Amino acid sequence: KVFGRCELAAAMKRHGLDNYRGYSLGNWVCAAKFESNFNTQATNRNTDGSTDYGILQINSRWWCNDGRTPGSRNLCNIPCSALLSSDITASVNCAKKIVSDGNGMNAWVAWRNRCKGTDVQAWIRGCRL
Ligand SMILES: CC(=O)N[C@@H]1[C@@H](O)[C@H](O)[C@@H](CO)O[C@@H]1O
Ligand SMILES: [Cl-]
Ligand SMILES: [Cl-]
Numbered sequence: 001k002v003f004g005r006c007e008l009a010a011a012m013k014r015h016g017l018d019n020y021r022g023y024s025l026g027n028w029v030c031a032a033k034f035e036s037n038f039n040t041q042a043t044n045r046n047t048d049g050s051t052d053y054g055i056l057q058i059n060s061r062w063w064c065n066d067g068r069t070p071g072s073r074n075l076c077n078i079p080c081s082a083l084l085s086s087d088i089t090a091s092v093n094c095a096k097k098i099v100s101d102g103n104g105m106n107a108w109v110a111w112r113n114r115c116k117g118t119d120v121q122a123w124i125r126g127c128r129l
């Protein structure tokens, strides 16, 4: 599923991401925009053999199991395919654990490089929330 911008902001807000660990909703929508272009089916292979999955590009090195990342963890206790569903519950729940692990949203490389320090409120501008 390719979410619309305001459609994804609503779903993130319903699942409790707005100001989760102090990150306003616009941060999460910006992160999704540059990680997956709002596409729940996005995948990308990392150089070390791990793979990032879904709308927030969550990495199999630490957070999910895909059966093909030897030595990795499954800290969110989910198959990585659950992160590709049109329902974003799994991605949001796992995002909440990642963002709580000490490093905030710096765990998302695209957020650090393309959202951090910008007007992230622009990303929820005009949305009925
Ligand atoms: C929280 C998380 O899994 N972030 C990943 C990061 O691990 C990975 O290096 C990158 C590759 O582009 O995508 C995402 O930002
Ligand atoms: Cl915001
Ligand atoms: Cl594995």
Ligand SMILES: [Cl-]
Binding pocket: 011, 086, 087, 088, 089
């Ligand atoms: Cl959803």
Ligand SMILES: [Cl-]
Binding pocket: 021, 022, 103, 104, 105
């Ligand atoms: Cl933080």
Ligand code: NA
Binding pocket: 060, 061, 062, 063, 064, 065, 066, 069, 072, 073, 074
């Ligand atoms: Na894993």
